[PDB]
């Protein structure tokens, strides 16, 4: 009702657009006011949902007014339009609309600036005056323009200050990262062109090396914002030094010119009166325009040669307004390359995770959303789309390309004429050669320019990243890391889930980032990170291979967490053996940095027993409450898991995972701020179900819904995968998640027996009965009985480890049932009775799924390995042991 009153019930001259909807809204408002008055002194929700249908065209026109509303849900659109005086509602959707802005800084009914996701503060040139008369779209448009102008102004100020002759180390403390980055790039390309006019490169190379050393020294004593900015400028300056050193080592002038032409150059027009079109970016003879959209301080990428060639081919495709296309195996730098190209072009690339649910209407609506905005659209995993949709949207994509190339003002898609911004572009990052993925038609493939990135450059990435972290020996350490990864990939068992590519190296570096405080930036840190990342995903012999090669190539307390685990297991009745504690160590260490985890082993090996007790112990250790949403993936349908588009009225219905993500994002009651959220997928890892979460699981950490909604993944929102086999899983969903392989059962046979026992007793004198039952149990003969049970023929083959449950529940239930007659007999008779009951329970739990002759053999062997003897027809009546022949009643059936 607040949203309805905001859109229609409060604003004037807004009820004259839809008079029938105006009358319906007035009637609903009167009914709600009457209900509220009655309460203060079902049907309403149904009426509201009925009048939502007439609001769809109004919402579509509102999205047409401000094109960035296409990335918002209908409820979010209602909230943002309705809140016309509070003005703090709009700041919540800044990340959904822009991507790099988390909120808006407000000061006395005015807009001072915006704040980036990482915490960077950008101050606007002119404070926007906000009044109750104005509504969202106008001041949002002028805020977008003001942000672009502020970015340009800070760029110009930083560039002028650097041209004055001052060093960058004093300028990085003044302006935003984007301004420093672009001004430094312009200065670098100007100075390199000046040096290339001559034939001297050593002087500028030495100057750049001194700048890099000064930045590295300044990084050690700066704040977190300044540290991130210095790290990103250090990435850019290392790229500068690499290019200058490559130019210096060049033999002749022509090859130096070719090398300079192959790399991005950041020029600036000195005669254009338009401020935002004053900077153009050059590579391979082509020119692209800087947009001056806010970027913030993103995780900058290392400038590998593959990255530069990908930038060159993206520029080659975009020069003719064609689409950019990246293909290759998983974890090779396609989506991140596109995002880095966008960041270098001064705009946030909007990434879409394609899926089977994206039909022609959904994909075309996303296309009209991104063409009206002018944003750069990346369609991640374009193969996952159905082939029919791929053929259908080819016309729309070709129309977008033709309109961009011919400068058409409007393009007609989805039976409507909408404006086409000239700043838009389309990118696709597909993964050919994978099962469960369709093949793009050639008429669609000719609309994109495809580039292959099968093999990245892990050595350069590792070297530059380790150098930025502050490592004294970086080249040798990076070479050792890459060589160790290669030997681990080559000299291990060739089973499908062993991938040692770029993603695991990035995970090793990210895990080596935070323990340098107490291990030190050396070799112990990197070997510990390598262990913590790779060892959980290795088997039994491959673990020994890991140890051997680690000792070959690399020469070189956690008491509280162990205590917390032990306390949690004691509360849960588990036994802390070496294997269980090792698995819990591995899970805790690999969940400390990796947010998505897969647990793989045999059925009943102890995956749930591991993650439950680790979660409990972390709740003890950190004091944070834990919420767990265990979802069986394949029980539900994909439309029932993520959501479905109702074709009756083109409205969105949430799934289960989407509902949980929206509930944790909304934070209505404020109890999810300081809690860890676990979503466990306890089913088979279907590529169709799971690969729809590709953008969720990687560094994007976003859920791209069909209706354009972009739900972020909070840092405390973690996803667990529980399964047995990775036979059908693709490497795309394997590399993204830290994998914890269960080589064997984490529990001994007797420890599992004891856990089932005391769990049954807790589910229920009693201590005497428990002690007598345990004394009846004899592990020395129990192990031999279990070993001899393996020789029997079993239908529906169940491991003997899994059959202890049925035996324990049968024994405990029999004792509880017969406890009524357990106070009028001697200790020996009681022991014999309990022994017979446990023997029949073991019989019908171990050999109960076998033939009668096998059951006779098993009762014979359980008699020889045990005590009251139990026969094939032994029984207890009401408490004397007898047989079946005295229990049969006389039956004389009638004729009918």
């Amino acid at each position: 009702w607040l949203d309805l009153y905001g859109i229609l019930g409060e604003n004037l001259d807004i009820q004259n657009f839809l008079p029938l909807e105006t009358s319906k809204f007035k009637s609903l408002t009167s009914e709600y006011k009457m209900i509220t008055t009655r309460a203060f002194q079902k049907l309403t929700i149904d009426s509201l949902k009925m009048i939502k249908s007439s609001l769809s065209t109004f919402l579509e026109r509102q999205r047409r007014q401000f094109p960035r509303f296409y990335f918002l849900g209908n409820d979010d659109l209602l909230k943002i339009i309705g809140s016309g005086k509070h003005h703090d509602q709009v700041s919540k959707f800044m990340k959904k609309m822009f991507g790099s802005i988390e909120s808006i800084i407000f000061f006395e009914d005015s807009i001072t600036g915006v704040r980036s996701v990482e915490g960077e503060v950008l101050n606007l040139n002119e404070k926007i005056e906000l009044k109750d008369s104005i509504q969202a779209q106008e001041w949002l448009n002028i805020l977008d323009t003001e942000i672009k102008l502020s970015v340009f102004t800070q760029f110009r100020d930083c560039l002028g200050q650097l041209k004055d002759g001052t060093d960058i180390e004093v300028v990085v403390s003044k302006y935003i990262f984007q301004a420093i980055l672009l001004s430094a790039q312009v200065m670098w390309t100007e100075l390199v062109e000046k040096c290339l006019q001559t034939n001297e490169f050593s002087k500028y190379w030495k100057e750049v090396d001194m700048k890099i050393k000064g930045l590295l020294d300044k990084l050690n004593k700066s704040s977190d914002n300044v540290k991130k900015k210095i790290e990103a400028l250090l990435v850019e300056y290392l790229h500068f030094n690499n290019v200058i050193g490559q130019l210096k080592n060049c033999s002749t002038k022509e090859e130096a010119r070719l090398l300079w032409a192959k790399v991005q150059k950041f020029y600036q027009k000195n005669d254009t009166l338009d401020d935002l079109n004053s900077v153009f970016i050059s590579q391979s003879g082509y020119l692209l325009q800087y947009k001056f959209e806010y970027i913030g301080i993103p995780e900058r990428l290392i400038y590998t040669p593959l990255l530069l060639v990908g930038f060159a081919t993206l520029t080659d495709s975009l020069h003719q307004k064609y689409g950019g296309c990246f293909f290759g195996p998983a974890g090779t730098g396609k989506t991140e390359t596109v995002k880095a190209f966008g960041q270098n072009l001064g705009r946030v690339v909007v990434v879409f995770n394609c899926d089977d649910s994206f039909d022609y209407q959904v994909l075309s609506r996303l296309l009209v959303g991104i063409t009206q905005i002018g944003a750069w659209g990346c369609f991640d995993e374009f193969n996952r789309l159905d082939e029919k949709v791929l053929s259908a949207v080819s016309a729309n994509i070709q129309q977008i390309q033709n309109g961009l190339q011919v400068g058409k003002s409007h393009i007609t898609l989805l039976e409507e004429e909408t404006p086409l911004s000239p700043h838009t572009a389309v990118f696709i990052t597909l993964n050919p050669g994978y099962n469960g993925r369709s093949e793009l038609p050639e008429n669609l493939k000719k609309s994109f320019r495809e580039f292959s990135m099968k093999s990245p450059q892990s050595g350069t990435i590792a070297e530059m990243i380790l150098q930025i972290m502050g490592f004294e020996d970086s080249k040798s350490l990076a070479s050792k890391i890459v060589h160790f990864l290669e030997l681990l990939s080559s000299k291990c068992s060739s089973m499908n889930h062993y991938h040692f590519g770029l993603r695991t190296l990035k995970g090793v570096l990210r895990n080596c980032s935070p323990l340098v405080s107490e291990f030190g930036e050396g070799e112990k840190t990197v070997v510990e990170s390598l262990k913590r990342v790779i060892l959980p995903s290795l088997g039994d012999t491959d673990e020994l291979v890991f140890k051997d090669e680690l000792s070959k190539i690399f020469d070189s307390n956690s008491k509280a967490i162990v205590q917390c685990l032990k306390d949690a297991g004691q509360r849960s009745g588990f036994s802390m053996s070496e294997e269980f504690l090792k698995k819990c160590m591995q899970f805790y260490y690999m969940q400390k940095t990796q947010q998505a985890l897969i647990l793989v082993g045999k059925a009943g090996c102890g995956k749930t027993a591991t993650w439950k007790t680790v979660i409990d112990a972390m709740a003890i250790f950190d004091g944070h409450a834990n919420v767990v949403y265990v979802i069986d993936t394949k029980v539900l349908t994909k439309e029932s898991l993520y959501g479905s588009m109702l074709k009756a009225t083109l409205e969105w219905r949430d799934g289960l995972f989407t509902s949980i993500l929206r509930r944790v994002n909304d934070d209505i009651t404020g109890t999810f701020k300081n809690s860890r959220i676990w979503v466990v997928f306890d089913s088979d890892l279907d590529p169709e179900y799971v690969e729809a979460m590709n953008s969720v699981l990687d560094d994007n950490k976003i859920l791209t819904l069909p209706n354009g909604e972009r739900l972020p993944i909070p840092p405390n929102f973690r996803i667990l995968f529980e399964t047995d086999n990775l036979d059908h899983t693709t490497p795309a969903t394997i590399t993204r998640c830290g994998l914890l392989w269960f080589s064997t059962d984490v529990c001994s046979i007797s420890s599992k027996i004891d856990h089932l026992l005391n769990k049954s007793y807790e589910a229920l004198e009693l201590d005497k009965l428990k002690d007598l039952i345990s004394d009846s149990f004899d592990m020395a003969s129990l192990t031999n009985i279990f070993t001899c049970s393996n020789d029997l023929v079993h239908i529906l083959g169940v491991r003997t480890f899994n059959k202890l449950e049925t035996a324990v529940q049968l024994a405990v239930h029999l004792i509880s049932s017969y406890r009524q007659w357990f106070q009028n007999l001697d200790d020996k008779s009681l022991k014999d009775v309990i022994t017979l009951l446990i023997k029949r329970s073991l019989l019908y739990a171990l050999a109960g799924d076998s033939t009668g002759e096998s059951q006779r053999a098993f009762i014979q062997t359980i008699n020889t390995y045990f005590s009251q003897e139990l026969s094939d027809y032994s029984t207890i009546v009401i408490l004397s042991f007898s047989s079946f022949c005295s229990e049969i009643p006389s039956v004389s059936l009638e004729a009918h």
């Binding site: 070719l258 290759g328 039909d359 791929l390 053929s391 259908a392 080819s394 008429n443 320019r449 292959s452």
Partner: protein
């Protein structure tokens, strides 16, 4: 006999079916366009020129050889038939034996097959008997029917050929790809509007809306002079209805087998330095597309170089020649960009990147005396010519080129034995199919 052969072809592949109405329309065209032999010869020429476009390259060669065999066996004597059959058998590796010497073309075929030039031996029948060929434009311009179906394998599309044909015919194409109900409704409305008003219409990927194709398209083709319809399907896709296919003209679009033919096609599809760079790019594209089909030896996989790569490389060449007006053309930059960005983006294996880099170094070496092929040399343009003069000079030096019989090895700079194996296998397949076809 020809109708039985075409029925056998339609038995082999669903797209190759033949209707009696189409054959009788061809027979009528024979008269629309020693006498009885002349009508028979014109019948053979017309049936080849019309129903060759509906077959791919191997079936083209098979049908050309079997029509040549039929005509020449009926006309000539039994010794000629025995000689031709022995040459086919030694091409099929079934009956190894020298032919009995008599005429003149017989020794030409014998020289082609003894020098292990299997491609020339296969195309000798086409070069000797038939003296005309049809492309998509000829099929459209010589058809009373207004409905057309074009088929090609996956990872190749002939939509750009139809767009070029519509541009040359001053018509309008409404490209409506199929696969969704909105596209189907738009196609229905556009079909009605184009029937009433005029204009062409192309449906793309019709094998993907098979229910709509089986009902609406079947009923519509079952029942304006400037209205034409085109539909694209895949040869490896799901089977299309026979009644719909038999009522439409069928075309198989496939890349030109020749090297010099591809150069001439790309040259005719288009200051002096721009023309020179276009000539060099066309030669490079033809050479790389010729080397592409050699799966294990020329490259490491099967690649697909199409008109988009040619367009992008030509645009890059024009931009380089536009921003470098000091006549110091960065030939190394052009080589690196064409080998790495334009034509190298699809290349996934590093050794194939090396061979395409070698090809670019050979083609775009930037030398005054460039020898792109062992026979033809391309001198650099002077500074006192014109664009038309350069166009004419390059066309003239293209016309004097004669492609040899061993051009799949010498022109591509490849070992001879791999070409021997490839040509031998292809000729064995073609001749075995023709032998299995002729005896019945």
């Amino acid at each position: 006999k020809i109708f039985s052969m075409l029925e056998k072809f339609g038995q082999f592949h669903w797209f190759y079916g033949i209707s009696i109405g189409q054959f009788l329309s061809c027979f009528k065209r024979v008269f629309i366009k020693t006498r009885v032999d002349e009508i028979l010869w014109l019948l053979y020429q017309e049936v080849y020129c019309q129903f060759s476009t509906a077959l791919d390259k191997k079936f083209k060669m098979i049908m050309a050889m079997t029509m040549f065999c039929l005509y020449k066996f009926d006309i000539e004597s039994e010794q000629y038939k025995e000689a031709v059959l022995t040459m086919i058998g030694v091409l099929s590796e079934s009956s190894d034996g020298v032919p009995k010497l008599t005429n003149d073309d017989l020794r030409y075929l014998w020289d082609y097959v003894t020098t292990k030039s299997y491609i020339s031996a296969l195309n000798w029948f086409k070069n000797e008997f038939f003296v005309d060929e049809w492309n998509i434009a000829d099929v459209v311009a010589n058809s009373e029917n207004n409905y057309f179906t074009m088929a090609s394998e996956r990872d190749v599309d002939g939509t750009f050929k139809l767009i070029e044909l519509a541009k040359a015919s001053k018509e309008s194409l409404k490209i409506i790809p199929l696969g969704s109900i909105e596209n189907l409704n738009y196609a229905q409305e556009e079909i009605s509007k184009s029937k009433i008003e005029g204009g062409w219409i192309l449906l793309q990927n019709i094998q993907m809306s098979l229910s709509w194709v089986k009902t609406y398209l079947h009923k519509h083709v079952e029942e304006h002079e400037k209205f034409k319809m085109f539909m694209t399907c895949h040869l490896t896709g799901d089977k299309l209805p026979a009644p719909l296919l038999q009522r439409t003209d069928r075309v198989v679009y496939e890349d030109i087998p020749g090297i010099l033919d591809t150069v001439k096609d790309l040259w005719g599809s288009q200051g002096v330095w721009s023309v020179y760079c276009t000539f060099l790019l066309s030669w490079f594209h033809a050479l790389i597309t010729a080397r592409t089909r050699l799966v294990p030896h020329g490259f490491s996989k099967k690649y697909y170089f199409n008109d988009c790569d040619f367009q992008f490389a030509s645009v890059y060449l024009e931009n380089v020649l536009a921003t470098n007006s000091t006549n110091n053309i960065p030939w190394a930059q052009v080589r690196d960009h064409i080998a790495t960005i334009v034509y190298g983006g699809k290349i996934d294996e590093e050794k194939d990147l090396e061979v395409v880099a070698k090809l670019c170094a050979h083609v775009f070496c930037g030398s005054d005396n460039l020898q792109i092929v062992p026979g033809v040399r391309i001198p650099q343009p002077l500074l006192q010519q014109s664009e038309e003069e350069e166009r004419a000079r390059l066309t003239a030096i293209l016309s004097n080129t004669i492609e040899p019989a061993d051009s799949l090895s010498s022109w591509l700079q490849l070992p001879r034995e791999s070409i021997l194996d490839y040509e031998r296998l292809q000729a064995k397949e073609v001749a075995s199919s023709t032998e299995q076809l002729l005896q019945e």
